[PDB]
Amino acid sequence: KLEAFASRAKIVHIDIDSAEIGKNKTPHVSVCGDVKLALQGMNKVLENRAEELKLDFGVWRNELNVQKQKFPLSFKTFGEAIPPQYAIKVLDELTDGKAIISTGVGQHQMWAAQFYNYKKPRQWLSSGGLGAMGFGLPAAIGASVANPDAIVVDIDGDGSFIMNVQELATIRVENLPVKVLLLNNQHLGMVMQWEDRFYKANRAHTFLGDPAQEDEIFPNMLLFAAACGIPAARVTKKADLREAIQTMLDTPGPYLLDVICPHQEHVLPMIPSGGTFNDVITEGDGR
Amino acid sequence: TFISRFAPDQPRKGADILVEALERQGVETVFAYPGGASMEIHQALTRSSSIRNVLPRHEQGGVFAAEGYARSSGKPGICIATSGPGATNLVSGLADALLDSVPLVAITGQVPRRMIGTDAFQETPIVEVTRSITKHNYLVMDVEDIPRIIEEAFFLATSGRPGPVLVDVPKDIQQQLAIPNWEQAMRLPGYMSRMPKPPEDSHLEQIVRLISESKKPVLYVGGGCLNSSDELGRFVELTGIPVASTLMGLGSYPCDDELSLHMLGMHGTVYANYAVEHSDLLLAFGVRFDDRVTGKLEAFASRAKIVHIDIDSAEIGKNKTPHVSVCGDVKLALQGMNKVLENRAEELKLDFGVWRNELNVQKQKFPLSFKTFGEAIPPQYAIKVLDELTDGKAIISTGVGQHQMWAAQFYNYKKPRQWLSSGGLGAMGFGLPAAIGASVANPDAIVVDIDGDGSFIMNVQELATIRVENLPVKVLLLNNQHLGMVMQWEDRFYKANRAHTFLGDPAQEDEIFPNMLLFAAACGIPAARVTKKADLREAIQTMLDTPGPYLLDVICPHQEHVLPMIPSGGTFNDVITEGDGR
Amino acid sequence: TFISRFAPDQPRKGADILVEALERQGVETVFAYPGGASMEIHQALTRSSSIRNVLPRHEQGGVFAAEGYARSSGKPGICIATSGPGATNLVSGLADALLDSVPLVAITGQVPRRMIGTDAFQETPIVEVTRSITKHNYLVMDVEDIPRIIEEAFFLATSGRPGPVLVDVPKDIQQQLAIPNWEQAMRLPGYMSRMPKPPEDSHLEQIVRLISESKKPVLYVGGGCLNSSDELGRFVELTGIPVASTLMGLGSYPCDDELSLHMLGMHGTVYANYAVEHSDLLLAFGVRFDDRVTGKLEAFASRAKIVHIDIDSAEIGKNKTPHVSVCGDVKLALQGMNKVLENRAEELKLDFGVWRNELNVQKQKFPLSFKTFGEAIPPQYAIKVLDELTDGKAIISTGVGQHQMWAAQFYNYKKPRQWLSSGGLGAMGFGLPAAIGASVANPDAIVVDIDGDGSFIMNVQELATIRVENLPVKVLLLNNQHLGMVMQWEDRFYKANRAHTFLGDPAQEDEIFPNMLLFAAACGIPAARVTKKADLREAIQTMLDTPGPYLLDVICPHQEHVLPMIPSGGTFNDVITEGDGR
Ligand SMILES: Cc1cc2nc3c(=O)[nH]c(=O)nc-3n(C[C@H](O)[C@H](O)[C@H](O)COP(=O)(O)OP(=O)(O)OC[C@H]3O[C@@H](n4cnc5c(N)ncnc54)[C@H](O)[C@@H]3O)c2cc1C
Ligand SMILES: Cc1cc2nc3c(=O)[nH]c(=O)nc-3n(C[C@H](O)[C@H](O)[C@H](O)COP(=O)(O)OP(=O)(O)OC[C@H]3O[C@@H](n4cnc5c(N)ncnc54)[C@H](O)[C@@H]3O)c2cc1C
Ligand SMILES: Cc1ncc(C[n+]2c([C@@](C)(O)OO)sc(CCOP(=O)(O)OP(=O)(O)O)c2C)c(N)n1
Ligand SMILES: Cc1ncc(C[n+]2c([C@@](C)(O)OO)sc(CCOP(=O)(O)OP(=O)(O)O)c2C)c(N)n1
Ligand SMILES: Cc1ncc(C[n+]2c([C@@](C)(O)OO)sc(CCOP(=O)(O)OP(=O)(O)O)c2C)c(N)n1
Ligand SMILES: COc1cc(OC)nc(NC(=O)NS(=O)(=O)N(C)S(C)(=O)=O)n1
Ligand SMILES: COc1cc(OC)nc(NC(=O)NS(=O)(=O)N(C)S(C)(=O)=O)n1
Ligand SMILES: [Mg+2]
Ligand SMILES: [Mg+2]
Ligand SMILES: [Mg+2]
Ligand SMILES: [Mg+2]
Ligand SMILES: [Mg+2]
Ligand SMILES: [Mg+2]
Ligand SMILES: [Mg+2]
């Protein structure tokens, strides 16, 4: 809700597109130009007038650090089931946060944004404006070609991954070290989450497996990688997760890791469409 | 409580629904020219006892009359035309109303729906033609959409930034019988969600904050203040900031006032452009930063903190990026700032008398000046006499050219909506029909068309409309026998090489051609010509005192130039202050 | 071998390249009205010794003059206007030239390229506006494209189905110095591959085959035959098929001939519509099956094998599906059919005298008739006198309305391009400017504008153009003090309820208003009014014999109706043959 967004703030908007300034939220001060130059100019002013300004926001920072400790990013671990949030956090640890991450679109896309600490820009490749499924696998191809000596990992969902699964042939032929961290929940997870919250968990074509063999992982993504000569492996128990991801990273060339996850997980926190901060959802799942 | 001429259960023609849709909007006057496609609408107009039609002699005159009706009253102007050649004759008026943000609703007849696209008799895709020169347009495809579309058309034409809205109505829809539903909801969800909110106090506080911190503030007032004359005057009493006005905002703040810098821009006063050049705070209220005002954008207000208030978000930062911006109604922004400036009056201690005297020095050293040659009539002097004899309380419409600038320079408009002139498009032939619409909307008003001999002749046929409708339209025709504005640019930038700018007869080179008095005689309008400056005061007085229409042919030396002048894309240091074509 | 005014290595302004591009196309006359955006072009025109400019008083007059120039000569008509209000005033002429397939090239000035889209001074997207009412248009974005675009513009405007082409030229391109390349290849690959080929013998054999097998053939001739008068006449000698013509094809086959069925359609003769109704072979040469000719399409030529020859493939089978079709030049198709009909002459033994006498019976029982009331002047009789006194060899331009139909009915045009009338769009105010362009293209010709009092006044300002350019334009003004055509439809279908069709002054109801003689007096044009039928013959003779311009105000009783009349969408059995508004 635009009226409630930054309702108490003087808004300074710097943007290189004049059509975006005052488009949805009218600012007080505006600068139409390169934010890179605007920062360089402001840094020189803040450096000369340093002792004159005596800037200190430690009181405001601690007001936020209180909210940071009382409402942190949290995930629940059920038995030996793999939490998708935990899997991404392990990938962060084992890659030292220096990997190029491309994602599909859905729940896995949010968890890749939440539980990975990107240290430099252009490590995070994700469809945000259009939100196009099937983006993750091909985008990793282009990232690996532009950065041959880089760790490229596609954190994809089972729905997004299959849409452009044909590009596994491209990865093998071009011999690209593309890693596929496939978070498999056998569902169109994001749509499933909205069904649980706002449609009484009434499933409307969000299950991606085979209803005949309801408890069988379908499709068998390992055989997609096998068809294109790509080493593959599946991990289901949380204890085996750390070694499985390490094997994916250490194995030269392409690799696909089918990470089975409980589908009842929800991306948290969540503000419903057109809501305010006081409408934030901080707890709950589909169980 | 509206009283219909039909029972709530009685089916009626779509044309009769269209007319009643106008009655429910408060429409009292339309400018309709009949044709095969709109005959049903014209029949339905005769059945209306509240809507009066002014039949023009050219649809371009009909739409220009609808503009004058709108500009001189604030009500929307309604013009109606038939399909094909009728609709295409409205094009200049639609584009003109869009560039000047004039509320206007144009209704065009159209071929029956089954014939659209078949190159039928008198068919043009008027919606496709006018999409880029209208605020919005419609093609009615069912008779039940007439109440909704007419309501949406008037709402879009008058709300927000006003503009023209065209409604194309096929003939079969005009004939189809139906029962209208007047309670339908308008289907404008995105436009109504984009409507600016009333301004927030936080934005208004920072503007008043910047006023107290400034030393050389200038008000940059334009056509957006035509409904804020009281709020703007109150704002000036509380701040004492000099007011520079655009050609569209003339009258928002009185030109005869001590704090008035008059017009700024290409032909604005030297002191008004000087104030903006060496200002530190530019209050741009209801303007659009046109090239005629700014010139070289980098040099325009190069030392000023720019505050831009505008109801169209697309205009904020479009050509000149401001520091503080407010997207909303300048009328409300002034009301909010007046309350702050009144409570915090003694706290702020606003006084810009030092900056005002720096401008009053430029006002006395570079004032608006004209030279008088022998007994020849100076056009500037003629307009100043009209100002004196009308007490500055006349409605002035103009054509486009040199006479248009002198009417803006040498007339002191006291209230807005006295100045009707084509500024954005600059369409010749606007003056005479616009005076028709102004006189109809203000029957007890002095309406004078300060026209040029080139502009006047373009829609001279509307003299018949003035006589038939018995409108007290005065025509102060400044006759220089030339396309004066183009002639001036020839003298300055093309070594006075005439390229089809003389309007007289080269055979009888010293004869006034055409004889405009006989144009007025053909339409039974009293006319007179004055050539000697001594006879000018009595001639204009005769025009005003003679009841009904009157045309005064004022002969002027053609070598006059509009001064001052800043060339296209120039700066303040490029201002031309002297010279003519002699 | 063309002789330039500049060295092959000498850079010149883009405007000077534009003018030379016109010289290399054979342009001798343009109709240009100056403005800020096109000032460079007007300066470059004065440097040309071969291109003469006729300055109009309204750009709508400029484009209508360019039409008359084109329609009366077969050359393309060139009109030039400035940006914004200048360009928008051409709109009615562009749409009019498109619907009537008139070769026309319009050049409009435009704001500098850097300012396009910024709502600059006098800017309208004229290319976006006129895309649907022009055959093609351009926006020149570089000075080096001027030779190519001007060549493509004239090629598209004149080849195939002719039409208007607009070229938008920004001001900075007019000022940019360059060296033109006159040898550039036109980039019209798809259009030139779609150009129809010369007709094949197999198609022509089957047409002549169907002629011998037919017993009631009718020629359906239209504006596509304006360049095939000789070939069409030869075709008629070899077949003896009666010729029914559209309003656009009048003159292709002589109206005074024994085999001429005159005009067909809504206001066509009873015998011409009868021939098409009971025909077995309809030779549709150069027509487009307009609703004015067909009415209810199912009933139009319901018993006829339809042969449609047309150079536009989009018109074949568009409204009426033919049996045999030929897509190409009707001039070539006639030449090919004439050779077959001449060799196989005695083999075919063509004789339709039995069908011709069936039509000559309808010709004698239902001829074009007018009633004479007292000494009042019948408009039909006035036009027939003009035919007699000019020997039928005059160039006739008309407005739109009742007078337009009577000029088509009661004048026997002997050659094509004598009849200049707005048929597709039907734009009032066409007659007077079109006569200007016709007189300029044919200085030694009798040019008469048969105008109506409503149409004449719309572009009455062009009377100044006629005087200044000293053009022998005669104005036969049929004055009925009404919008006659709309008045006729009111009497027939709206119980004579007048809805804004009276053009005089209701105060002085019996006074001729306006006094058109004073319009001509204002522009120094000899004028006279005639009211009694006895004085009519001498009055028209005085108009013709008086050198230079002349206006003859012919007063007519307004209750006259154009007869016969087929209502909109009717059949032949719905023809109205008698009645008026008394
Ligand atoms: C020959 C000629 C010479 C000219 N020379 C000059 C000249 O020297 N000087 C000059 O000033 N003009 C000149 N012009 C006129 C000109 O080109 C422009 O029309 C004018 O400069 C711009 O007017 P404006 O800035 O007031 O904007 P407008 O066209 O009047 O539009 C109003 C602006 O305010 C906003 N607005 C409207 N309503 C509201 C509201 N209720 N609240 C808040 N905002 C609102 C609109 O969004 C728009 O941006 C000339 C014209 C001609 C034909
Ligand atoms: C008030 C009024 C009343 C009217 N009433 C009538 C009426 O009763 N009767 C009437 O006929 N009109 C009437 N019209 C005129 C009208 O609406 C149309 O313009 C006319 O009917 C159609 O003309 P057309 O068939 O010759 O086609 P045009 O508009 O002349 O086009 C020519 C056709 O031939 C083709 N062509 C062009 N050149 C060639 C070539 N070299 N070779 C082969 N083909 C070519 C073109 O592709 C096009 O299809 C009236 C107009 C008005 C204003
Ligand atoms: C081409 C395309 N088609 C459909 C889409 C509509 N959406 C989504 C959304 C957010 O855009 O909803 O608007 S997300 C989504 C399902 C995500 O399946 P997953 O890959 O398994 O990821 P997860 O980890 O399980 O959640 C769909 C169907 C889409 N974006 N792209
Ligand atoms: C429909 C139309 N066509 C051409 C125009 C281009 N202009 C002008 C301009 C400023 O728009 O130049 O760009 S002004 C002008 C000539 C003015 O003739 P006047 O009426 O006699 O007035 P004056 O007192 O003598 O100067 C022309 C030809 C125009 N605007 N409208
Ligand atoms: C720019 C324009 N505006 C309106 C038009 C709609 N029409 C007509 C029509 C056939 O197009 O009806 O559809 S004819 C007509 C009136 C004719 O007035 P007159 O000149 O006096 O001729 P007359 O000898 O008296 O009959 C009008 C109003 C038109 N065509 N052009
Ligand atoms: C009043 O003068 C005339 C003249 C005239 O032709 C001579 N025809 C008509 N009427 C129609 O044409 N009706 S229609 O066929 O439904 N149309 C295509 S339309 C929408 O009206 O253009 N009126
Ligand atoms: C001759 O009369 C006038 C009047 C006038 O204003 C008063 N301005 C100009 N000249 C320009 O405007 N040049 S320009 O700035 O490049 N244009 C935007 S344009 C293409 O010409 O419209 N001529
Ligand atoms: Mg854990
Ligand atoms: Mg999934
Ligand atoms: Mg004096
Ligand atoms: Mg006119
Ligand atoms: Mg003039
Ligand atoms: Mg007789
Ligand atoms: Mg008439």
Coordinates of C-alpha atoms in Angstrom, one line a residue, chain A:
Chain A
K1 CA 0.0 0.0 0.0
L2 CA 1.8 3.1 -1.3
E3 CA 0.1 5.4 1.2
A4 CA 1.6 3.5 4.1
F5 CA 5.0 3.0 2.6
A6 CA 7.6 5.3 4.3
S7 CA 4.7 7.5 5.6
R8 CA 7.0 9.4 8.0
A9 CA 10.0 9.8 5.8
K10 CA 11.5 12.5 3.7
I11 CA 12.1 10.6 0.4
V12 CA 15.2 11.2 -1.7
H13 CA 15.0 9.4 -5.0
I14 CA 18.1 9.1 -7.3
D15 CA 17.4 7.5 -10.6
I16 CA 18.7 7.7 -14.2
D17 CA 15.2 7.4 -15.7
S18 CA 13.2 10.6 -15.3
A19 CA 10.0 8.6 -15.8
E20 CA 10.6 6.7 -12.5
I21 CA 10.9 9.9 -10.3
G22 CA 7.5 10.5 -8.7
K23 CA 5.9 7.7 -10.7
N24 CA 4.4 5.8 -7.7
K25 CA 5.8 7.7 -4.6
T26 CA 6.4 11.4 -4.8
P27 CA 9.7 12.4 -3.3
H28 CA 10.9 15.5 -1.5
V29 CA 14.3 15.8 -3.1
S30 CA 15.1 14.2 -6.5
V31 CA 18.2 13.7 -8.6
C32 CA 18.0 12.5 -12.2
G33 CA 21.3 11.0 -13.1
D34 CA 23.9 8.3 -12.4
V35 CA 23.7 7.1 -8.8
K36 CA 27.4 6.3 -9.1
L37 CA 28.3 9.9 -9.7
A38 CA 25.9 11.1 -7.0
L39 CA 27.6 8.9 -4.5
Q40 CA 31.0 10.1 -5.5
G41 CA 29.9 13.7 -5.1
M42 CA 28.3 13.1 -1.8
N43 CA 31.3 11.2 -0.5
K44 CA 33.6 14.3 -1.1
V45 CA 31.1 16.5 0.8
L46 CA 30.8 14.0 3.7
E47 CA 34.6 13.7 3.9
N48 CA 35.5 17.4 4.0
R49 CA 32.6 18.4 6.3
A50 CA 33.2 15.2 8.4
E51 CA 33.9 16.8 11.8
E52 CA 31.5 19.7 11.0
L53 CA 28.5 17.3 10.6
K54 CA 29.2 14.9 13.4
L55 CA 27.0 12.1 12.0
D56 CA 26.0 9.4 14.5
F57 CA 22.9 7.2 14.1
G58 CA 23.9 4.6 16.7
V59 CA 20.6 5.2 18.6
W60 CA 18.5 4.4 15.5
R61 CA 20.8 1.5 14.6
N62 CA 20.2 -0.1 18.0
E63 CA 16.5 0.4 17.6
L64 CA 16.8 -1.8 14.5
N65 CA 19.3 -4.2 16.0
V66 CA 16.5 -4.9 18.6
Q67 CA 14.1 -5.8 15.8
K68 CA 16.9 -7.8 14.2
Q69 CA 17.3 -10.0 17.3
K70 CA 13.6 -10.3 18.1
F71 CA 12.4 -11.0 14.5
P72 CA 15.2 -12.7 12.6
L73 CA 15.0 -15.0 9.6
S74 CA 13.9 -18.3 11.0
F75 CA 13.3 -21.9 9.7
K76 CA 12.0 -25.0 11.4
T77 CA 13.7 -28.3 11.2
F78 CA 11.4 -31.4 11.1
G79 CA 13.1 -34.7 11.9
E80 CA 15.7 -35.6 9.3
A81 CA 13.8 -33.8 6.5
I82 CA 16.0 -31.2 4.7
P83 CA 15.0 -27.6 5.3
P84 CA 15.5 -25.7 2.0
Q85 CA 16.6 -22.7 4.0
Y86 CA 19.3 -24.8 5.7
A87 CA 20.5 -26.3 2.3
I88 CA 21.1 -22.8 0.9
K89 CA 22.9 -21.7 4.0
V90 CA 25.2 -24.8 3.7
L91 CA 25.9 -23.8 0.1
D92 CA 26.8 -20.4 1.4
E93 CA 29.2 -21.8 3.9
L94 CA 30.9 -24.3 1.6
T95 CA 31.3 -21.7 -1.2
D96 CA 32.5 -18.9 1.1
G97 CA 29.7 -16.8 -0.3
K98 CA 31.7 -16.2 -3.5
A99 CA 29.5 -18.2 -5.9
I100 CA 27.4 -16.9 -8.8
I101 CA 23.8 -17.9 -7.9
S102 CA 21.0 -18.1 -10.6
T103 CA 17.5 -19.1 -9.6
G104 CA 14.2 -19.9 -11.0
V105 CA 11.0 -18.3 -9.6
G106 CA 9.1 -19.4 -6.5
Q107 CA 9.8 -20.4 -2.9
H108 CA 13.3 -21.5 -3.7
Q109 CA 14.0 -18.1 -5.3
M110 CA 13.1 -16.3 -2.0
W111 CA 15.1 -18.7 0.1
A112 CA 18.1 -18.2 -2.2
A113 CA 17.7 -14.5 -1.6
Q114 CA 17.2 -14.8 2.2
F115 CA 19.8 -17.4 3.2
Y116 CA 22.8 -16.5 1.0
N117 CA 25.1 -13.6 1.9
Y118 CA 26.1 -12.1 -1.5
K119 CA 29.3 -10.2 -1.0
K120 CA 29.6 -8.4 -4.4
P121 CA 26.9 -7.4 -7.0
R122 CA 26.4 -9.5 -10.1
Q123 CA 26.5 -12.8 -8.1
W124 CA 22.7 -12.8 -7.8
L125 CA 21.0 -13.6 -11.1
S126 CA 17.2 -13.8 -10.7
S127 CA 14.1 -12.8 -12.7
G128 CA 12.5 -10.1 -10.5
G129 CA 10.4 -7.9 -12.7
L130 CA 8.8 -10.5 -14.9
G131 CA 9.5 -13.4 -12.6
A132 CA 9.9 -16.0 -15.4
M133 CA 10.2 -19.6 -14.5
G134 CA 12.9 -21.5 -16.4
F135 CA 15.3 -18.6 -16.0
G136 CA 17.8 -20.3 -13.6
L137 CA 19.3 -23.1 -15.7
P138 CA 20.0 -21.0 -18.9
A139 CA 21.1 -18.0 -16.9
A140 CA 23.8 -20.1 -15.2
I141 CA 25.0 -21.1 -18.7
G142 CA 25.5 -17.5 -19.7
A143 CA 27.1 -16.7 -16.3
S144 CA 29.6 -19.7 -16.6
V145 CA 30.6 -18.6 -20.1
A146 CA 31.3 -15.0 -19.0
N147 CA 33.1 -16.2 -15.8
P148 CA 34.8 -19.5 -16.6
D149 CA 36.8 -19.6 -13.3
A150 CA 33.7 -18.9 -11.1
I151 CA 31.5 -21.2 -9.0
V152 CA 28.1 -21.1 -10.8
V153 CA 25.2 -22.7 -8.9
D154 CA 21.6 -22.8 -10.2
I155 CA 19.3 -22.9 -7.2
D156 CA 16.2 -24.1 -9.2
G157 CA 12.8 -25.4 -8.4
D158 CA 11.4 -28.7 -9.8
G159 CA 8.8 -26.7 -11.8
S160 CA 11.2 -24.0 -13.1
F161 CA 14.0 -26.5 -13.7
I162 CA 12.0 -28.7 -16.0
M163 CA 10.7 -25.8 -18.2
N164 CA 14.1 -25.4 -19.8
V165 CA 15.6 -28.8 -18.9
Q166 CA 16.7 -29.2 -22.5
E167 CA 19.6 -26.8 -21.7
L168 CA 21.3 -29.6 -19.8
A169 CA 22.5 -30.8 -23.3
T170 CA 24.0 -27.3 -23.8
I171 CA 25.8 -27.6 -20.5
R172 CA 27.4 -30.9 -21.3
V173 CA 28.4 -30.1 -24.9
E174 CA 29.9 -26.7 -23.9
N175 CA 31.6 -28.4 -20.9
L176 CA 30.4 -25.8 -18.4
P177 CA 31.0 -26.3 -14.6
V178 CA 27.3 -25.5 -13.9
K179 CA 26.1 -26.8 -10.6
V180 CA 22.3 -27.4 -10.1
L181 CA 21.1 -27.2 -6.5
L182 CA 17.6 -28.4 -7.2
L183 CA 15.2 -27.8 -4.3
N184 CA 12.6 -30.4 -5.0
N185 CA 9.2 -30.0 -3.2
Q186 CA 7.1 -31.8 -5.9
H187 CA 4.9 -28.7 -6.1
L188 CA 4.5 -25.3 -7.6
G189 CA 5.5 -24.1 -4.1
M190 CA 4.8 -20.4 -4.3
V191 CA 1.3 -21.0 -5.7
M192 CA 0.8 -23.8 -3.1
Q193 CA 1.7 -21.3 -0.3
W194 CA -0.9 -18.8 -1.6
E195 CA -3.5 -21.7 -1.7
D196 CA -2.8 -22.5 2.0
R197 CA -3.1 -18.9 3.1
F198 CA -5.9 -17.5 1.0
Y199 CA -7.8 -20.4 -0.6
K200 CA -8.2 -22.9 2.3
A201 CA -5.4 -25.2 1.0
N202 CA -7.6 -26.1 -2.0
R203 CA -5.0 -27.5 -4.5
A204 CA -5.7 -26.2 -8.0
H205 CA -3.1 -27.9 -10.3
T206 CA 0.0 -27.2 -8.1
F207 CA 1.2 -30.8 -7.6
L208 CA 4.0 -31.8 -10.1
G209 CA 4.4 -35.5 -9.3
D210 CA 2.4 -38.5 -10.3
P211 CA -0.8 -39.0 -8.4
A212 CA -0.7 -42.8 -9.1
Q213 CA 2.7 -43.1 -7.3
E214 CA 1.9 -40.3 -4.9
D215 CA 5.0 -40.8 -2.6
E216 CA 7.4 -41.3 -5.5
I217 CA 9.7 -38.4 -6.5
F218 CA 8.4 -37.5 -10.0
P219 CA 10.0 -36.8 -12.3
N220 CA 13.3 -38.5 -11.6
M221 CA 15.5 -35.5 -12.2
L222 CA 18.6 -37.6 -11.9
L223 CA 17.8 -39.3 -15.2
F224 CA 17.4 -35.9 -16.9
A225 CA 21.1 -35.3 -16.0
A226 CA 22.0 -38.9 -17.0
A227 CA 20.4 -38.3 -20.4
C228 CA 22.9 -35.5 -20.9
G229 CA 25.9 -37.2 -19.3
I230 CA 25.9 -35.0 -16.2
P231 CA 26.8 -36.5 -12.8
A232 CA 23.8 -36.4 -10.5
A233 CA 22.8 -37.4 -7.0
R234 CA 19.8 -37.2 -4.6
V235 CA 19.9 -36.4 -0.9
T236 CA 16.9 -36.7 1.4
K237 CA 18.3 -36.9 5.0
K238 CA 19.6 -33.6 6.5
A239 CA 22.8 -35.3 7.9
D240 CA 23.9 -36.3 4.3
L241 CA 23.2 -32.8 3.0
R242 CA 26.6 -31.3 3.9
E243 CA 28.6 -34.0 2.2
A244 CA 26.3 -34.1 -0.8
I245 CA 26.7 -30.4 -1.6
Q246 CA 30.5 -30.8 -1.0
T247 CA 30.5 -33.6 -3.6
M248 CA 28.7 -31.4 -6.1
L249 CA 31.2 -28.6 -5.7
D250 CA 34.3 -30.8 -5.7
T251 CA 33.2 -32.9 -8.7
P252 CA 34.6 -31.2 -11.8
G253 CA 32.3 -30.2 -14.6
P254 CA 28.5 -30.1 -14.4
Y255 CA 26.6 -31.6 -11.5
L256 CA 22.9 -31.9 -10.4
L257 CA 22.0 -32.4 -6.7
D258 CA 18.3 -33.3 -6.2
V259 CA 17.5 -32.0 -2.7
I260 CA 14.2 -33.4 -1.4
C261 CA 12.3 -30.9 0.8
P262 CA 9.0 -31.1 2.6
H263 CA 6.5 -29.2 0.6
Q264 CA 4.6 -27.7 3.5
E265 CA 7.3 -25.1 4.0
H266 CA 6.3 -21.4 3.6
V267 CA 8.4 -18.4 2.7
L268 CA 8.5 -16.1 5.8
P269 CA 7.9 -13.4 6.5
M270 CA 5.1 -12.4 4.1
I271 CA 3.2 -9.2 3.5
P272 CA 0.0 -9.9 1.5
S273 CA -0.6 -8.2 -1.8
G274 CA -1.3 -4.5 -1.2
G275 CA -0.8 -4.7 2.6
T276 CA 1.1 -2.7 5.1
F277 CA 3.8 -3.4 7.6
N278 CA 1.2 -4.1 10.3
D279 CA -0.2 -6.9 8.0
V280 CA 3.1 -8.9 8.1
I281 CA 2.8 -12.6 8.5
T282 CA 5.6 -14.0 10.6
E283 CA 4.6 -17.6 11.4
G284 CA 2.8 -20.6 9.9
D285 CA 3.0 -23.3 7.2
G286 CA 0.7 -25.8 5.6
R287 CA 0.5 -28.6 8.2

